[PDB]
Every structure is written in structure tokens, then in C-alpha cells.
Amino acid sequence: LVQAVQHVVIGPSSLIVHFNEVIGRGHFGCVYHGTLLDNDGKKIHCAVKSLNREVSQFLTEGIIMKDFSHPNVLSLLGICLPLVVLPYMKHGDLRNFIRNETHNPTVKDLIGFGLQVAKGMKYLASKKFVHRDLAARNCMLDEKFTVKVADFGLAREYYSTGAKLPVKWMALESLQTQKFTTKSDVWSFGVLLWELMTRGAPPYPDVNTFDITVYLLQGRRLLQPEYCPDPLYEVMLKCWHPKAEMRPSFSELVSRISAIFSTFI
Ligand SMILES: COc1cc2c(Oc3ccc(NC(=O)C4(C(=O)Nc5ccc(F)cc5)CC4)cc3F)ccnc2cc1OCCCN1CCOCC1
Numbered sequence: 376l377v378q379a380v381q382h383v384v385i386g387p388s389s390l391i392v393h394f395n396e397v398i399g400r401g402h403f404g405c406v407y408h409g410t411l412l413d414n415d416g417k418k419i420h421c422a423v424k425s426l427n428r429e430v431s432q433f434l435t436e437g438i439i440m441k442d443f444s445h446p447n448v449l450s451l452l453g454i455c456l457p458l459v460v461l462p463y464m465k466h467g468d469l470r471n472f473i474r475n476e477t478h479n480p481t482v483k484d485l486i487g488f489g490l491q492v493a494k495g496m497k498y499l500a501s502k503k504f505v506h507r508d509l510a511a512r513n514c515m516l517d518e519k520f521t522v523k524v525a526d527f528g529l530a531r532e533y534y535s536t537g538a539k540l541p542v543k544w545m546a547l548e549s550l551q552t553q554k555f556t557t558k559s560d561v562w563s564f565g566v567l568l569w570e571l572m573t574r575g576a577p578p579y580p581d582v583n584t585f586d587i588t589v590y591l592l593q594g595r596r597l598l599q600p601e602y603c604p605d606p607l608y609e610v611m612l613k614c615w616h617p618k619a620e621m622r623p624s625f626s627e628l629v630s631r632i633s634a635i636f637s638t639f640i
């Protein structure tokens with residue numbers, strides 16, 4: 376842990392945290408605007424993730440990130456003895472971007488964001504990593520409109536054994552056994568595409584949190600969104616297959632969505 380922290384350790388001298396500017400705050404964590412300095416003295420706008428007051432939990436979260444080098448996965452700039460330094464994402468979380476009525480992305484752009492999460496998840500599934508909390512709320516969007524798959528971790532109504540669970544994003548086997556696999560990230564990815572094609576509408580509004588397991592066993596799935604092309608809805612239904620082995624891999628997801636995306640001007 377600390378041998379790895381020391382590899383990505385940032386000097387307090389190199390980082391200025393703007394405590395006067397909070398991008399957001401939860402009970403466990405807080406996110407500030409920040410300026411990171413390189414050896415040439417150039418300034419890097421960043422986000423400083425801090426604990427309000429479980430210290431090793433925070434540092435493990437940031438240490439897992441050090442292994443992730445992909446354009447569709449959020450990177451760690453470093454740890455400062457503690458504060459976790461992340462690259463600043465000009466557009467915030469994906470759900471909030473798509474939910475803005477004045478933003479007008481085309482059906483192709485929304486599919487394009489869906490292909491980006493799929494590419495990132497492919498890379499993660501390759502590294503044997505299981506996300507556990509895939510949702511549009513945990514996908515970041517940078518200046519060049521590049522989706523970065525992330526997790527607000529400690530800094531994170533959509534969540535209900537101490538388990539704080541995102542039940543509406545969860546696979547049948549995960550809701551019934553609290554065990555997660557890459558195949559269960561595929562289910563959540565299906566819910567993520569539904570979210571994108573509805574432009575941040577809440578999944579299963581009419582449905583309660585706890586009751587979601589019996590809703591699904593009745594043979595119910597999210598309806599086809601209005602912007603959603605038919606082949607893309609077929610993809611979503613493959614993600615929500617009750618048996619895990621029948622769900623498309625993320626590699627097949629990149630494939631099928633690349634072919635749907637490529638049919639638009
Ligand atoms: C809420 O708004 C923002 C939040 C940001 C942010 O938050 C975090 C995201 C993820 C982590 N993750 C983590 O700390 C970890 C993680 O992500 N691990 C992880 C896990 C799996 C994976 F695949 C990749 C990474 C837990 C360690 C930590 C963060 F602090 C990081 C960087 N830039 C941000 C910009 C934001 O708005 C910009 C301003 C937008 N304005 C425009 C409109 O007006 C008002 C809003």
C-alpha cells in the first residue's frame with residue numbers, strides 16, 4: 376500500500392487546494408478545485424478529493440486507480456499526505472451532462488458516450504477488475520468530451536449486512552447473493568445505456584428500491600427509450616439476461632455498439 380502511495384506521492388509544496396471552492400460535498404468526502412504544479416512550474420487544474428474527518432479505505436480507492444491507464448477510465452494524478460488528486464473533468468458526471476435541457480446531443484452522440492464506457496469497461500474486464508457501481512452518475516466527461524469511467528467512492532436516493540446498494544442498477548444474481556462479477560457489470564452497463572437514451576431519466580420510477588428483485592422475476596425489464604434504436608434495445612435486453620453466462624461480454628459490447636453507432640451520419 377504505502378510502497379505504492381510513495382510511487383504516486385505528490386509534495387504539499389506542489390499542490391494548492393482552493394478550500395474556498397467546493398465542487399461538491401457528501402458525509403464521508405469533499406471535492407475541491409485545485410492547482411497542481413509540475414517541475415517546470417506550470418499549473419494543472421485538478422480536483423482535490425478529501426475526507427471530512429476508514430483512512431486506509433480512502434487510500435486503497437486511490438491506489439487501485441494507479442494501475443488504470445486507459446482514455447475511458449479516470450486517472451489518478453497523485454496522493455498528497457490526505458488528498459487524492461484527479462484530472463479535472465470540465466463537464467462533470469455524465470448523468471448531469473445529459474440531464475441538462477439546454478444540451479442537445481444527437482442519438483449518435485449518446486451512443487458514442489455508451490461506446491466509450493463499453494471501451495473503458497473492456498479494458499477493466501481485461502484487468503480482472505469488477506466496478507460494482509456502474510451508472511451514468513459515476514462516469515466523468517472531460518473538455519474533449521471523453522467519457523472517463525470512475526467511482527465517486529466515499530464522496531458518493533439511488534442507493535439503499537451494512538450494504539449501501541444501487542439496487543436499480545443491479546443484476547438478479549447480485550441482488551439475491553450480494554456477489555458481483557464482470558457479467559454483473561454488464562447488467563449495470565445495460566442500465567447505463569437506458570439512462571443515456573432517456574437522457575438521465577430515473578430507472579424504474581414507479582418501482583420501489585427493495586421491491587426491484589420481485590419486479591424483475593415477474594419478467595419485467597425497462598421499456599425501450601424513445602431515442603433508442605431497435606438494435607440498441609436488443610443489446611440492452613442481452614445485458615439483462617437472467618443467467619450471467621448468456622450476457623454479452625464487454626468485448627462483444629464494443630463490437631455491436633460500434634456497428635450501431637457507425638450507421639449514423
Ligand atoms: C461533481 O462535479 C465534479 C466532480 C469532479 C470529480 O469528482 C470525482 C470523481 C471521481 C472520483 N473518484 C475517485 O476518487 C475513485 C475512482 O474513481 N476510482 C475508480 C474506480 C473504477 C474505475 F473504473 C475508475 C476509477 C475512488 C477512487 C473522485 C472525484 F473527486 C473529479 C474531477 N473533476 C470533477 C469535476 C466536477 O464538476 C466540474 C464542474 C461542472 N460544473 C459545470 C456546470 O455548472 C456546475 C457544474
Ligand SMILES: [Cl-]
Nearest residue numbers: 605606608609
Ligand atoms: Cl426492438
